[PDB]
Design a binder for these strands. Structure first.
Length: 67
DNA sequence: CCATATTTAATCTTC
DNA sequence: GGAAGATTAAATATG
């Protein structure tokens, strides 16, 4: 019988964090879990934040792909 | 197959 | 106002 809990604060990426994600995206848009773990450790972000960033990046590039 | 994980598509939300 | 981070259920992928 759980109450409705609020959302986590929206992540505000630093420039170094975003550059780390973009550089990995360049070699694969779908990092395996080991890579997501490595990226989480290098950025200090949670593995979920890492996964979601790639999710959202893929959605963005998919729309652009048809111009 | 079957349980679990990941991804997709769509959207809600906020910086 | 607009890009994008966070969430959701469904679909697809994986072991």
């Amino acid at each position: 019988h759980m109450h409705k809990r609020p959302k986590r604060p929206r992540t505000i990426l630093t420039t170094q964090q975003r550059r780390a994600f973009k550089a990995s995206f360049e070699v694969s848009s779908k990092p395996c879990r080991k890579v997501r773990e490595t990226l989480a450790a290098e950025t200090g972000l949670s593995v979920r934040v890492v996964q979601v960033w790639f999710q959202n990046q893929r959605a963005k590039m998919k729309k652009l792909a048809r111009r």
